[PDB]
Write a structure and sequence with these properties.
With 437 residues, the protein is α+β, with helices and mostly antiparallel strands. It is built from 16 helices and 16 strands. Helix 6 packs across helix 7 and helix 11 packs across helix 14. The radius of gyration is 27 Å and the shape is elongated. The structure holds cytidine-5'-triphosphate (CTP) and magnesium ion (MG). The structure holds one RNA strand of 33 nucleotides. It comes from Archaeoglobus fulgidus (strain ATCC 49558 / DSM 4304 / JCM 9628 / NBRC 100126 / VC-16).
Length: 437
RNA sequence: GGCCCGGGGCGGUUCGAUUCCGCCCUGGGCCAC
């Protein structure tokens, strides 16, 4: 049951079976045919072109090569039109760099425009160095595509796969680059156990040096960090995962963990056992793309957390959840209620000028001296986290993310108790509190 | 959109703010494929 045995069973979970390969090829063929009628230059990139896509995740990436001189606007317009006329059913919903998604003979496809250059330098559009990533990988990943699939499947099952902002994990390309560096999934896992937050992995130079932050230099452009969007905590989760896997290998590390339900009744008893203040800020989900939403939910969530900590409610952790129509910012504090009074540090008895200005203030209790300096009893405007959040969110909505803020401005409410466990956030609450089972 | 570095105007809070909470101008990088 040692590693190598597990890796064999694992291959079954990550390698596409002959039937799925068929579908992808036929779609590839058809897709080329359609493209070969309109003329137009194109290059298949990504995991389908390199035969490193994960089982049950077949998505063909076609990149339309345009002349450098063309305007950004021409790019989207032509790409849009070409995308639409080439797909059975389509859908446009770019985030910054436009592109068209669709289905050809049942397979997902991504038609993306990009400028055609020589030398991946002075990139015109944000995705220009992608075709060069394909060239560089072409002759070096050949024969290790299965090692790539194991790594992707590992990260996928543990929730740190993608590099979109929702995940802030490992991109596919990053994965491929790691296979070319260490040679296999097993070696990557073995070495990643010793990675640090200053680790720099440079495949073009076959080197590993210590830097200012986790960096995986792009062979194509040594100034771009391929793991730029990999968050620190997620880097940390992978390293820990690699350690655990080596100690007690298991096919489980490649199988997705089910949301694993819990009765909102068990959740209520846990919160009571904990004795904390658990609540959420609910508002309507802005109609924007994931890559726009999450960073905003992240800011909002953080801005409120910081409010809760400087206000002494002792926040434990924060979380957030986006559903079809609403969003939720979750919080947990050790302080369900604080006194109305508190002490505010004053000047040292020494300089009377400021002592006066300090005592000149209208106060309900009369300041005192303690260890050489004046202190005053002040009165809070709120005494619970919810009251505090309600206030802050009503007045500081503009700093809670462009769209998330404007939405909280037109409406939001604070949910807690039984009425909160009925919302679709139980998974996030359990993960946030470390509930196990 | 978010994050990092920088210039310049303000508001609030404070005994006391460049130094905490925010707002308006604006320059330069990075990420998302
Ligand atoms: N953060 C990212 C995302 C994408 N890419 C470029 O876009 C390709 C990845 O496109 P994507 O479709 O997001 O993933 P795949 O690489 O195709 O792999 P998989 O579909 O299995 O996730 C990479 O090879 C690379 O050229 C990149 O450089 N950095
Ligand atoms: Mg793909």
């Amino acid at each position: 049951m040692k590693v190598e045995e597990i890796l064999e069973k694992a291959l079954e979970l990550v390698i596409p079976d002959e039937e799925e390969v068929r579908k992808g090829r036929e779609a590839e063929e058809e897709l080329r045919r359609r493209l070969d009628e309109l003329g137009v230059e194109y290059v298949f990139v990504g995991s389908y072109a390199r035969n490193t896509w994960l089982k049950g995740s077949l998505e063909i990436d076609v990149f339309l090569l345009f002349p450098e001189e063309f305007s950004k606007e021409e790019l989207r317009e032509r790409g849009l039109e070409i995308g639409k006329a080439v797909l059975d059913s389509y859908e446009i919903r770019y985030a910054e760099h436009p592109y068209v998604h669709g289905v050809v003979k049942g397979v997902e496809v991504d038609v993306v425009p990009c400028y055609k250059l020589k030398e991946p330098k002075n990139i015109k559009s944000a995705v220009d160095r992608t075709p060069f990533h394909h060239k560089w990988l072409e002759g070096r990943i050949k024969g290790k595509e299965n090692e790539v699939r194991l790594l992707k499947g590992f990260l996928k099952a543990n929730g740190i796969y993608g590099a979109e902002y929702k995940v802030r994990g490992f991109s596919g390309y990053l994965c491929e680059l790691l296979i070319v560096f260490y040679g296999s999934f097993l070696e990557t896992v073995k070495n990643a156990r010793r990675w640090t937050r200053r680790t720099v992995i440079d495949v073009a130079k076959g080197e590993v040096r210590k830097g200012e932050e986790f960096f995986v230099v792009d062979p194509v452009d040594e100034k771009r960090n391929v793991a730029a969007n990999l968050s620190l905590d997620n880097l940390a989760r992978f390293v820990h995962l690699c350690r655990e896997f080596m100690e007690a290998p298991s096919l489980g590390f490649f199988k997705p963990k089910h949301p694993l339900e819990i009765e909102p009744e068990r959740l209520r008893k846990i919160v009571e056992e904990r004795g904390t203040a658990v609540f959420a800020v609910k508002f309507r989900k802005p109609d924007i793309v994931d890559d726009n939403l999450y960073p905003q939910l992240e800011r909002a969530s953080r801005k409120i957390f910081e409010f809760l900590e400087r206000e002494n409610f002792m926040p434990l952790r924060s979380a957030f959840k986006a559903s079809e129509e609403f969003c939720y910012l979750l919080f947990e504090c050790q302080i369900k209620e604080i006194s109305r009074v508190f002490r505010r540090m004053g000047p040292q008895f020494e300089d009377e000028r400021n002592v006066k200005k300090f005592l000149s203030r209208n106060r309900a209790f009369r300041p005192f001296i303690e260890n050489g300096r004046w202190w005053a009893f002040e009165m809070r405007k709120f005494t619970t986290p919810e009251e505090g959040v309600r206030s802050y969110a009503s007045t500081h909505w503009h700093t809670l993310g462009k769209n998330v803020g404007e939405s909280i401005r037109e409406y939001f409410e604070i949910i807690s108790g039984e009425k909160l466990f009925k919302e679709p956030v139980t998974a996030e609450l359990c993960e946030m509190m470390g509930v196990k089972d």
